[PDB]
Write an enzyme that holds these catalytic residues in place. Sequence first.
Site, PDB file in Angstrom:
ATOM      1  N   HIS A  55      -1.328   1.838   3.982  1.00 31.45           N
ATOM      2  CA  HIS A  55      -0.260   1.369   4.869  1.00 31.45           C
ATOM      3  C   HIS A  55       0.453   2.502   5.586  1.00 31.45           C
ATOM      4  O   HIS A  55       1.322   2.215   6.418  1.00 31.45           O
ATOM      5  CB  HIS A  55       0.762   0.488   4.126  1.00 31.45           C
ATOM      6  CG  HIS A  55       1.595   1.205   3.101  1.00 31.45           C
ATOM      7  ND1 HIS A  55       2.598   2.094   3.435  1.00 31.45           N
ATOM      8  CD2 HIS A  55       1.609   1.118   1.749  1.00 31.45           C
ATOM      9  CE1 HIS A  55       3.173   2.545   2.332  1.00 31.45           C
ATOM     10  NE2 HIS A  55       2.588   1.973   1.294  1.00 31.45           N
ATOM     11  N   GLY A  71       9.673   7.034   0.651  1.00 28.74           N
ATOM     12  CA  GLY A  71       8.855   8.230   0.669  1.00 28.74           C
ATOM     13  C   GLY A  71       8.109   8.521  -0.614  1.00 28.74           C
ATOM     14  O   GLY A  71       7.323   9.473  -0.647  1.00 28.74           O
ATOM     15  N   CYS A  79       5.772   6.653  -1.899  1.00 27.71           N
ATOM     16  CA  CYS A  79       4.429   6.084  -1.885  1.00 27.71           C
ATOM     17  C   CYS A  79       3.386   7.180  -1.946  1.00 27.71           C
ATOM     18  O   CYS A  79       3.564   8.261  -1.380  1.00 27.71           O
ATOM     19  CB  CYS A  79       4.201   5.235  -0.635  1.00 27.71           C
ATOM     20  SG  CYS A  79       5.161   3.744  -0.695  1.00 27.71           S
TER      21      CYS A  79
HETATM   22  C1  LIG Z   1       6.697   4.007   0.257  1.00 29.89           C
HETATM   23  O1  LIG Z   1       7.050   5.165   0.236  1.00 29.89           O
HETATM   24  C2  LIG Z   1       7.687   2.845  -0.032  1.00 29.89           C
HETATM   25  C3  LIG Z   1       8.202   2.931  -1.466  1.00 29.89           C
HETATM   26  C4  LIG Z   1       9.246   1.834  -1.758  1.00 29.89           C
HETATM   27  C5  LIG Z   1      10.558   2.002  -0.977  1.00 29.89           C
HETATM   28  C6  LIG Z   1      11.714   1.962  -1.990  1.00 29.89           C
HETATM   29  N1  LIG Z   1      11.059   1.935  -3.290  1.00 29.89           N
HETATM   30  C7  LIG Z   1       9.729   1.872  -3.206  1.00 29.89           C
HETATM   31  O2  LIG Z   1       8.978   1.833  -4.133  1.00 29.89           O
HETATM   32  N2  LIG Z   1       7.037   1.586   0.238  1.00 29.89           N
HETATM   33  C8  LIG Z   1       7.502   0.717   1.108  1.00 29.89           C
HETATM   34  O3  LIG Z   1       8.513   0.961   1.721  1.00 29.89           O
HETATM   35  C9  LIG Z   1       6.756  -0.659   1.409  1.00 29.89           C
HETATM   36  C10 LIG Z   1       6.021  -0.492   2.724  1.00 29.89           C
HETATM   37  C11 LIG Z   1       5.139  -1.709   3.094  1.00 29.89           C
HETATM   38  C12 LIG Z   1       4.208  -2.133   1.923  1.00 29.89           C
HETATM   39  C13 LIG Z   1       3.344  -3.339   2.289  1.00 29.89           C
HETATM   40  C14 LIG Z   1       2.519  -3.041   3.530  1.00 29.89           C
HETATM   41  C15 LIG Z   1       3.390  -2.605   4.713  1.00 29.89           C
HETATM   42  C16 LIG Z   1       4.288  -1.430   4.339  1.00 29.89           C
HETATM   43  N3  LIG Z   1       7.703  -1.769   1.419  1.00 29.89           N
HETATM   44  C17 LIG Z   1       8.443  -2.163   0.432  1.00 29.89           C
HETATM   45  O4  LIG Z   1       8.353  -1.627  -0.671  1.00 29.89           O
HETATM   46  O5  LIG Z   1       9.303  -3.146   0.644  1.00 29.89           O
HETATM   47  C18 LIG Z   1      10.417  -3.398  -0.276  1.00 29.89           C
HETATM   48  C19 LIG Z   1      11.618  -2.396  -0.258  1.00 29.89           C
HETATM   49  C20 LIG Z   1      12.613  -2.329  -1.235  1.00 29.89           C
HETATM   50  C21 LIG Z   1      13.666  -1.420  -1.174  1.00 29.89           C
HETATM   51  C22 LIG Z   1      13.745  -0.525  -0.104  1.00 29.89           C
HETATM   52  C23 LIG Z   1      12.762  -0.567   0.889  1.00 29.89           C
HETATM   53  C24 LIG Z   1      11.734  -1.485   0.792  1.00 29.89           C
END
Ligand SMILES: *[C@H](O)[C@H](C[C@@H]1CCNC1=O)NC(=O)[C@H](CC1CCCCC1)NC(=O)OCc1ccccc1
EC number: 3.4.19.12
Lengths: 301, 301
Positions: free
Chosen positions: A41, A143, A145
């Site tokens: 992603h 960040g 991920c």
């Molecule tokens: C990657 O770095 C982040 C890690 C997240 C953010 C806060 N805690 C985590 O573990 N991942 C994301 O932001 C996700 C991105 C999406 C995933 C599905 C495909 C499209 C891109 N989204 C996500 O985790 O959503 C929930 C969320 C909760 C709290 C703060 C931000 C986002």
Amino acid sequence: SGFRKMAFPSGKVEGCMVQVTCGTTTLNGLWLDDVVYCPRHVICTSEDMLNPNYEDLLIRKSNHNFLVQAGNVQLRVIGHSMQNCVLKLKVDTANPKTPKYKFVRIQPGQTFSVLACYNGSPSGVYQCAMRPNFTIKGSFLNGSCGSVGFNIDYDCVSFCYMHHMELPTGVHAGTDLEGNFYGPFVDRQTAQAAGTDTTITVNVLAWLYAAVINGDRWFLNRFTTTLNDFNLVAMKYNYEPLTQDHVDILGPLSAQTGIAVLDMCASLKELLQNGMNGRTILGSALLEDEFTPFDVVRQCS
Amino acid sequence: SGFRKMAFPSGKVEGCMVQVTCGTTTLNGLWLDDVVYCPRHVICTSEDMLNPNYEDLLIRKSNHNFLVQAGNVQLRVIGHSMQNCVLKLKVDTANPKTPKYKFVRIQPGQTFSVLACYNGSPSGVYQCAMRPNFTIKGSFLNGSCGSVGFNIDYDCVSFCYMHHMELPTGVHAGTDLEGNFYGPFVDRQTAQAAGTDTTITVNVLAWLYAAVINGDRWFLNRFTTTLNDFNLVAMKYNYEPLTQDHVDILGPLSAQTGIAVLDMCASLKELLQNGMNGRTILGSALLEDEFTPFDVVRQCS
Ligand SMILES: *[C@H](O)[C@H](C[C@@H]1CCNC1=O)NC(=O)[C@H](CC1CCCCC1)NC(=O)OCc1ccccc1
Ligand SMILES: *[C@H](O)[C@H](C[C@@H]1CCNC1=O)NC(=O)[C@H](CC1CCCCC1)NC(=O)OCc1ccccc1
């Protein structure tokens, strides 16, 4: 003596963490030999992630859309590909810190260490269990991920988790290193939620054995139950059934304490029904289920 | 989101751990530049450790009584000396993995990461607090002596603890890297015991702020106490008095949640008097005092 939540030393995995940038998004990658592994992603645009078509998105990318930094030196991507929900980036430099490693898909109830990273730089290490509902209760910010989870087995690093997302209840979901999600989750921003959890019975029992090895005996009794009558109690309190396999895995701990598994089950039964009455076990006022029998052996001898 | 007990990544310290052997005893040393640091009781004989004279014992040693192994390659000792309760071994090879580092003596209530080692090889990493009684609740087996505790501050490793011994209650005692014991303890096998502990109030409050940042609010109330009336409650429940310095250290967390310190104190007061009533805070059924305000900031942003 003493019993602490212990992670594996993270040094071998620290040498592998890099930063991956695609357009406006930045997260962490795993640099093993000449391949970088990261969540796919990272190629998602902020608008087209409600329901993205990753094969199209990737066809529209080229090697120069990906920026990889190991420390400060930039890595040039010479190839890219997708395997399930992970992106693979061929780089021209093999990682000279590449350890002996394997990719392993773990079972619920197993634990691993998580090296949380931001911008390619390790920030902290902690221990995690794969919950029965295929989430982990991590600690992850924006960040994070691409941070990985791993176990160590005589300098062979077994990677088993890469981080992708946070669920609405604050728990976390990701893939094995071959890009298959644990659980039913998918990598698009939708309404997926964690299912109801259960407590990992074999781990609670391993933790009770660690308590005995460390001098906490106030919960022992003389009763012994059977497997069938214990599992009826497990069902009532939302515990995973105890299998014969689990009984045998607990053998070494049973042998070291001289308390048979089914003897330890009759203590757990009493704890579930009557609580702790203000007592603690290994510094905890509730039953702990994130230590495997292996974790207990490794730390108690 | 999420809140976990987190250690610093241990890689920079892993590259420094060596094995030190003197006669029949083996423990861990810290190899920094061309000096190896380890507990001086490695030169103790099994009979003459009820009350040893370390200056005599060391005068009777020579460089060839000490065997140092970094990985597999043996290190030759070209000098030795004693500083308080640590032995220093000059070796002919500077450690090429020597990080930027400092030696720091910490205050009770501060936390650090412990890299437990056996035979020079890192086994696991975990977080620890210096208790008010100058012990730590570690997890240490035979051969763990010389394992170090440390904090990291932008790739400068601040070493603050080296492990020497276990006390009768299963807790642990050691020195700073300059060989001064924390607390009243001494390195001979006698009847020294840990004193009565107290709970680190400023840490409990930092942990309550982490709970708020992570969505646990059931313990908040509208009450606000004063410093003087709070410290009367602290005395009754064996908590360290709250100082003005502590209030100011909690500022950033107070600002981020919009809950003033003295507002958070009136919630702690209610928890101490009425308990949790079967509720948890950040997965715990008791109040946790091994997170500093710094640990909370680092993990909650
Ligand atoms: C990657 O770095 C982040 C890690 C997240 C953010 C806060 N805690 C985590 O573990 N991942 C994301 O932001 C996700 C991105 C999406 C995933 C599905 C495909 C499209 C891109 N989204 C996500 O985790 O959503 C929930 C969320 C909760 C709290 C703060 C931000 C986002
Ligand atoms: C060094 O490696 C050990 C570490 C101890 C053993 C178990 N857990 C630990 O933390 N240190 C020692 O064995 C001490 C040696 C003495 C220290 C004073 C000067 C003379 C040498 N002794 C010690 O810790 O005694 C208590 C103990 C408890 C449980 C098992 C063994 C020893």
